[PDB]
Structure formats: C-alpha cells, structure tokens
Design an enzyme around this catalytic site. Structure first.
Site, mmCIF file in Angstrom:
data_model
loop_
_atom_site.group_PDB
_atom_site.id
_atom_site.type_symbol
_atom_site.label_atom_id
_atom_site.label_comp_id
_atom_site.label_asym_id
_atom_site.label_seq_id
_atom_site.Cartn_x
_atom_site.Cartn_y
_atom_site.Cartn_z
ATOM 1 N N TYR A 82 0.915 -0.996 0.181
ATOM 2 C CA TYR A 82 -0.037 -0.086 -0.198
ATOM 3 C C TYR A 82 0.932 1.088 0.094
ATOM 4 O O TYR A 82 1.469 1.666 0.739
ATOM 5 C CB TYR A 82 -0.934 -0.034 1.136
ATOM 6 N N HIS A 113 -12.400 1.071 -4.281
ATOM 7 C CA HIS A 113 -11.480 0.362 -5.096
ATOM 8 C C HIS A 113 -12.129 -0.904 -5.565
ATOM 9 O O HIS A 113 -13.268 -1.629 -4.491
ATOM 10 C CB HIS A 113 -10.099 -0.190 -4.402
HETATM 11 SM SM SM Z 1 -8.985 5.145 1.378
#
Ligand code: SM
Ligand code: SM
EC number: 3.1.11.2
Length: 280
Positions: free
Chosen positions: A133, A271
């Site tokens: 990430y 997402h």
């Molecule tokens: Sm977020």
C-alpha cells in the site's frame, strides 16, 4: 464543468490457460478495502468466498493487528493470515493464503519506510509475493518528496528480491502510469497519483527490477479500465476512475501468465478487486 459521461468497460472473460496451454494453478486476489471492518460489514468476505483465491492481499486495512474482526476466522481456504499495521487506524496490509508460505517478512528493510505497515513479503517455493500500500502523495502534494524517497527505496528492495527468485508485486501502488490509466489525465497532472514524479517512478520501477504490468501486457490498448473511483461525484457510475491497483511480474513469469483481471462489479470499497491467474 465536468466533461465525463459514462464510459463502458466490460472486463473480458477469465483466460485460465497460459500461452502454452498450461492451466492456471495459482489465483491471487488483491483489494484496497478502505477499512477492514467497513469492508467486512459491506460483505467483502462473501465476494472472497465466491472468488475462492489461493492468496488474498488486502490494502488499507486501517485495523490494529490486535483488533481483527472475528469474521476472518470463517475463511477455511485462507487459514494462513498475516497482517502489518503502522508502528492505529490507518494504512495497513494483510495477506491470507491457502498454503503456508516458506517465510513471511514485513517492510522493505529500511527503518524510515517500515513504520506505516505498508508491506508484506510471502516467500513460496517457486516465487516471492509482495503486497503493498504505497504512500499517497497527499493533498497539495505535501508528501510527494517523501513518496519519491519511498519509490527509490522500494525499487531497490524489490530489485534485490527479484535477483534471487521470481517476483510478483501486487497492491495499491497509488499511481496511474499512463494517460490510458485514468479517465481525466489532463486535469490531474498536478494531483497525487498522476504527477510526473510519480509516473516516472513507476516507469523506473518497471525498468529497474525489471517488472511487467500484467494487465497492460495482455491489454496494451484497452481504455477505461480502472480500479478506483472517488465515492463522491457519482464517479463509479460514470466510470471516472483511476487504475491504481496492479500485479507486476518478473519477466521470467510472463510465460506463466494466464490473465490479469479487474473485477469492476465487486462492491464494498471505493476500489474494486483485481485477480491474477498464473500457471505455476
Ligand atoms: Sm481510502
Ligand atoms: Sm504517454
């Protein structure tokens, strides 16, 4: 004001056999869940159960390793679960596997970049898997200088891993490589995720490791394929998004690549998940 109306995108059917005819043996799913608890509440695990991947990588769990939802204990096919959170409530990644990895590591070996729980490395017999990430450049680009340092350290770390074993990198890399990777390139040239600094960084990552963008390798000219849409401005319904999630592979793994998917219809976050099929 806004010039975008709906732009259609239908991810093609799953190609489960490699160029040489070898059926996929490994199915990996990656998903920025925008909060592990929120996502689970939104039935994220029901999608996981149906997808039945061999490995599941999650980003932005925003959850303490000591406060994991009990619902995670109901994933029989993904009993090996590892997590990494900041040195609570932000960033964080997870990796769940059907088979137990030879070794799991956290971070990239650089103290400065290892305190926000952004990386998990799981080594298997024939390859090493990394989920990440990547740090966002931030509003006003207040964190772009830091992001550039991260990009360099991350690139060096990965080149090191790939020099010994085939590598698979997946996750929210927080950057849309090319113009084709986001719906509004002209208006985001100075925004986080599409700055020259970030794009050049991604390009250098591909060249230096080296790594190949699995999706773009298979679909070099396919537009409107995104993995993120702002919750605001009804962006998802109009497909005004960004492709920020990837599966990057060592060149040696290309002959084993079956398909790289974007699960546009899976809800539960801002997402959508992505799935990789490899014939190992
Ligand atoms: Sm977020
Ligand atoms: Sm270009």
């Amino acid at each position: 004001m806004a010039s975008e109306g709906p732009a259609l995108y239908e991810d093609p059917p799953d190609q489960k056999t490699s160029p040489s005819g070898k059926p996929a043996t490994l199915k990996i799913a990656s998903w920025n869940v925008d909060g592990l608890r929120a996502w689970i509440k939104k039935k994220g695990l029901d999608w996981v159960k149906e997808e039945a991947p061999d490995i599941l990588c999650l980003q932005e769990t925003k959850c303490s390793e000591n406060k994991l939802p009990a619902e995670l204990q109901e994933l029989p096919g993904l009993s090996h679960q590892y997590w990494s959170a900041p040195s609570e409530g932000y960033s964080g990644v997870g990796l769940l596997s059907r088979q137990c990895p030879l070794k799991v590591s956290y971070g990239i070996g650089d103290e400065e970049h290892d305190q926000e729980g952004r990386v998990i490395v799981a080594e298997f017999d024939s390859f090493v898997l990394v989920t990440a990430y990547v740090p966002n450049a931030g509003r006003g680009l207040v964190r772009l200088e830091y992001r550039q340092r991260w990009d360099e350290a991350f690139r060096k770390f990965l080149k090191g891993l790939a020099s010994r074993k085939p590598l698979v990198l997946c996750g929210d890399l927080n950057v849309a490589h090319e113009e084709i990777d986001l719906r509004n390139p002209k208006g985001n040239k100075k925004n986080a995720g599409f700055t020259p600094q970030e794009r050049q960084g991604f390009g250098e990552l591909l060249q230096a490791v080296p790594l190949a963008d699995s999706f773009r390798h298979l679909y070099p000219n396919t537009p409107y394929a995104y993995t993120f849409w702002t919750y605001m401005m009804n962006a998802r319904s109009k497909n005004v998004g960004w492709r920020l999630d990837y599966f990057l592979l060592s060149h040696s793994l290309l002959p084993a690549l079956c398909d790289s998917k974007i699960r546009s219809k899976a809800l539960g976050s801002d997402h959508c998940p992505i799935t990789l099929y490899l014939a190992l």
